[PDB]
Amino acid sequence: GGSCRTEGMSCEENQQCCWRSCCRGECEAPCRFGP
């Protein structure tokens, strides 16, 4: 519900994140922790 999450805001996936990109806790681009 409501407005999308911006970069670095907390989430569960692309579908709430306005970046349409990977999120395992915050709105991100690389779909993996560390290198």
From Swiss-Prot:
Gene Ontology CC terms, in alphabetical order: extracellular region
Residue positions where Proline amide is found in the record: 35
A GO molecular-function annotation: potassium channel regulator activity
Localisation: Secreted
Principal cellular location given in the protein's record: secreted
Annotated Pfam families: Conotoxin_I2 (PF17557)
Residues marked Pharmacophore (site): 20, 32
Tissue note: Expressed by the venom duct.
Biological role: Kappa-conotoxins bind and inhibit voltage-gated potassium channels. This toxin inhibits Kv1.2/KCNA2 and Kv1.6/KCNA6. Produces stiffening of body, limbs and tail when injected intracranially into mice.
Family, as annotated: Belongs to the conotoxin I2 superfamily.
Name recorded for this polypeptide: Kappa-conotoxin SrXIA
Organism listed in the record: Conus spurius
Taxonomic lineage: Eukaryota, Metazoa, Spiralia, Lophotrochozoa, Mollusca
